[model samples]
Target chain A: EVKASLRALGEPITLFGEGPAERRERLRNIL
Target chain B: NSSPVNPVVFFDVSIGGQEVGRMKIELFADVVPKTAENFRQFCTGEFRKDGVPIGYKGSTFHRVIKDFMIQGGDFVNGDGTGVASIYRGPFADENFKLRHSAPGLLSMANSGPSTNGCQFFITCSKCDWLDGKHVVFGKIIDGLLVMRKIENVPTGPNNKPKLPVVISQCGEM
Candidate 1:
């Protein structure tokens, strides 16, 4: 769910599956 | 009709010992005067501090992500953790009215809110998630394909470009 929501914004700067998971985890951690 | 004359700048990019094309950027001066002027001076090498020249020339795109964007403007360290802004320090975001609607959109690369400096990035694709997060100030009017070339280059740890994606020259066009 998180990955889909984040990736909907398009690619981020991550190698592990285009960074959606990474940035989502980042956003999660930030909040 | 009298126009406000938005500034068009050019950056001669070089990579892997080859002289690539010059990427032209159109800074939305009317939209974001503070941010656009800072970037303009950075390109012209007129924005000085301590009587020292600190600008975008000779800087490299230290961070690049495929299908994302390319980040640079760390004229000090040229890596990622350097401060070089015409304001002499981080400044507040001018506005978020501009959208990260499509590829070739240029925006500030900041640490957090109101922490903008010389560091900036150009979107390789539509990055709506960064709309309010990053201040959209400009767009690539020409040479966008060259930007694509930069993004396609191989990257290593921390998404660093394997080939030197250096800004060999930059100035107002």
Candidate 2:
């Protein structure tokens, strides 16, 4: 669901050093 | 007050060769000469940068704020995205002694400070909020009824006239 959210905003699912927790935070920002 | 006794510049606006209105602009040559000249050259169809007559001909009033203003002079895009020359770049604003205190005042529409472009709007009623923000250079000495008629045309989304009110020809007069 987190990756799907990021994909909806056309942003990369993850950054170079990002983990699942950080990726979820990024997706929240996108929302 | 009385009208200017001296000779003034006039810009005749129309669509399909039929007369719509005429605007007489009082040039603040000493105050905002750059902007005034830019408008004058555009009217005369003598606006040339690389030796070409790229002027305010065949342009449409893209935006019309009814009982507010009607804007045009985007000869390049024929929309509200035209820029001005005659100063190499977007010129600085001059301190002209006028305000948007009355209707029929001609003013320059800019995005920010010193962004005086080819776009302008004519006020249909007092717009005091715009005073000192836009450049007021002229007024409609004649054809108030025609100006009102043009202003009353039906507009769709974005305030664009359903029937185009075009400036078929404009020149110094």
Candidate 3:
């Protein structure tokens, strides 16, 4: 359950003009 | 950036825009699924546009033992009052499934699992050693500073919290 939520938060299920893989990495780092 | 993260883990911590903790939250679904569902609903924006808040109007800091713990947020007879709904309710009754309250363990805040309403508490001290009798909900995540700040809330009765724990706002991800 924790991993599922983390996966949801760690990845973007959408797209557009979004960047900041760093933030994702930051989140990834925490998990 | 990129909306930070969606459905952030129950304990994901973000301080000063930095992702510093996990949202290691314990959903109240098992013990109080209605409240849990309400929280989920709120997280999913069911209460967003309407500006509806699950607030405990006249509750105050009901109990406070310096360095031990500060228990409040009870809408019925709590120490502090909240402008937002505590989002407390009843679910499946996990009383038998209740686990030991650890430092970072997230549980639900209920007067009683059956009477599960909108009231929760966080430990100011390590309460993991308590006997099997005591139950704990919502444990601290990464920011002990925030929890400490909460403990610092002034109480006229020193032993009882005479204030309300107000949720300015809540969001997910």
Highest-TM-score candidate: 1
lDDT of 1 by residue, B1-173 (tens): 69887977778889986878888888999999999999988887665677765688888999999988999888889888887677778999999999999999999999899999889999999998988999999999889988998998899999999889988887765
- Residue range with the least summed lDDT across 10 consecutive positions in model 3 chain B: B4-13
Candidates in descending DockQ order? 3, 1, 2
lDDT string, candidate 2, B21-101, tens digits: 765555555556677777776766555677676666667788888989988877667778778666665777776478988
TM-score of each: 0.83, 0.74, 0.48
**Candidate 3 lDDT tens digits, B1-173:** 55322122232222223333233344545454454554444333344325543332223336555566655445444443422333433443334345544444434444433444444555655665553333433334445665555466555655653444343233333
* Cα RMSD of predicted structure 2: 21.5
Regions of candidate 3 where Cα sits further than 4 Å from its true position:
A1-31, B1-35, B38-64, B72-92, B96-100, B128-138, B158-165
lDDT of each: 0.82, 0.71, 0.42
User: Sorted by TM-score, highest first, which candidate order results?
Assistant: 1, 2, 3
Query: What is the fnat value (0 to 1) for candidate 1?
Result: 0.00
Ranking by lDDT: 1, 2, 3
Model 1 residue runs over 4 Å out of place are A1-31
Reference contacts reproduced by model 2:
0.00
Deviation in Å, model 3, residue B30 alpha carbon: 8.6
Which residue pairs of candidate 2 clash?
none
Candidate 1, pairs of clashing residues: none
Candidate 3 per-residue lDDT, tens place, A1-31, comes to 4334445664422111112463455456667
